[PDB]
Design a protein around this ligand. Structure first.
Ligand SMILES: [Ba+2]
Ligand SMILES: [Ba+2]
Ligand SMILES: [Ba+2]
Ligand SMILES: [Ba+2]
Ligand SMILES: [Cl-]
Ligand SMILES: [Cl-]
Ligand SMILES: [Cl-]
Ligand SMILES: [Cl-]
Ligand SMILES: [Mg+2]
Ligand SMILES: [Mg+2]
Ligand SMILES: [Mg+2]
Ligand SMILES: [Mg+2]
Lengths: 175, 175, 184, 184
């Protein structure tokens, strides 16, 4: 009851173009291993994207550190702020460091802005964002590196779930 | 090898004056149980203060909800931002709610400001602070309700530790 | 107190009970030669235990018992729990408790299985001893009672507020232990 | 790779090993009638296991095995750990794992006691089965080896970087498993 939307080779092809585009944008920063690009992986749905994107960034000679954050939605009392409860926070300080928030798909603009405000509180040198799936409004202003464009659809596979199932599929499918 | 600095009855006497002062300041807000004053208890050192202050706030007819946060210091890479790693975050949304950060003593201005930035990201109606022990500089601008003034000293008791020991003492002592 | 139908135990009654319990605890651990460097660890289960922890620690101070305090916080799962009572740890202890004496501090035992899980959790840290102290012992058969070691106030079954315990996150700040009026 | 003295296992070598391991896993759980609603849970120990988890899950997908993924993250304690290997849980699983089949996913077994603790931790959630998969099996006597169930690549003792594994939080992004040059 699922149809393929993007195959692994397509996702890889798109992620690899994204990696070169990232690599050329951060050239002017002279990144090093003591001052790398930090990949901020938002669990769970981003973990396979992060793993593949990291290695594509290695292909470009970009130095990478990998941080994970995990947050839980509130049942009530969130209207305009996208507040989520932080369960896992970064192991390393990110003061004056270059952060790339790695998302699979922007479910909630306002919740994305909240996470951005949370990281901005940590005084980073730069905050930018890379979203695997981009369905094209005026909250594209929040997304810097949209990897692949898709129509409005409930998707699974490639780390993304329906009810915790199907994260393990190589291709991205729709329901 | 410890001398008493403040006895329980003194701490209580001061906290009770603070509770009335708080109660009269938030009168203009018409607090209710659906819109209370949230006490943000910064673990561990504040837990006994919070427990006593809450009940003093009950004496004033202030409605109270109690949140806990726990954060760990970074070993390296923090210079100007007071970044700490959040281990426990609030169970309730605080959007448009009245928050009172409950500290025992301001060890680090910049780390206090970081926690303040973290809460401010959650869009509260008001953010204010109450610090049990206040040693009198220009970061008094960060402290709204200093309960008791003391000289520069390493203190223990009343929830406050030296090496996790002595939180359980009724009186505040110095070393 | 306007939201209280009955008052169940007053602040003064709770303290007196807790002072008695602290002396029972201090007698039971005299043989164990507790030091500052090998104290009794108070495991405050958040949130409900926190006022009770703050007072019980000070009654233990009266008894001359060296203490340290650790906090844990666990969230319940939406489904898939039947026999095990597992909960998602959101905050684990800051100090290792290997070969230490731990007292799990609880306000009420509302699920014996989850209490059992918390203990299995704690027993995996290989403590020297593990006991529990429950402020409100509510009606229970042998299954629960073998879990609780130090019941402070034996109490009939009711909806309690106050003394750290909540209704819809409200009323923890009350000085007395109250019964919530039906019209909440 | 400039920071690499030797190359230990290449990306292509690791995949081939992991595909073989995934088929061994899929044969071993055929009897258990794994469903979407009763799958094999992958317990990714952060951070080092994450690239390995992402690839191993997709090799399990090739084998037709239904998966779910949970992450845990634990910090080491400064002191007071000797026999128990306990670690402070910073992230516990999001789903209950009561009566489920769990595979702890590890990059290397660097402390048998801490691996034992993680298992005691997991065994308290009363899973239906608990097994471990380790990408790099390094030299070890019977003590460790009885803990590891599915070793992917048997390997000599060295300082590895790449494929998720780090030096000073650097080099996780490398496609190959490398040996760090002495002059780091
Ligand atoms: Ba996501
Ligand atoms: Ba403090
Ligand atoms: Ba409780
Ligand atoms: Ba590992
Ligand atoms: Cl198809
Ligand atoms: Cl596209
Ligand atoms: Cl004195
Ligand atoms: Cl004063
Ligand atoms: Mg989802
Ligand atoms: Mg301290
Ligand atoms: Mg409750
Ligand atoms: Mg490491």
């Amino acid at each position: 009851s699922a149809h393929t939307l993007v195959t692994q080779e397509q996702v890889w092809a798109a992620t690899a173009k994204c990696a070169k585009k990232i690599a050329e944008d951060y050239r002017s920063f002279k990144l090093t291993t003591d001052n790398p690009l930090y990949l901020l992986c938002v669990l769970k749905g981003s973990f396979i994207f992060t793993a593949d994107l990291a290695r594509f960034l290695a292909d470009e000679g970009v130095p990478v550190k990998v941080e994970f954050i995990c947050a839980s939605s509130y049942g009530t009392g969130v209207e305009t702020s996208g507040q989520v409860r932080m369960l896992l926070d970064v192991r390393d300080s990110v003061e004056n460091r270059h952060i790339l928030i790695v998302e699979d798909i922007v479910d909630s603009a306002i919740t994305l802005q909240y996470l951005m405000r949370f990281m901005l509180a940590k005084k980073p040198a730069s905050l930018k964002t890379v979203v695997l799936l981009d369905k094209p409004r005026k909250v594209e202003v929040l997304v810097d590196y949209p990897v692949i464009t898709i129509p409005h659809a409930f998707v699974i596979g490639y780390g993304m779930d329906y009810a915790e199932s199907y994260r393990e599929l190589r291709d991205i499918c729709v329901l």
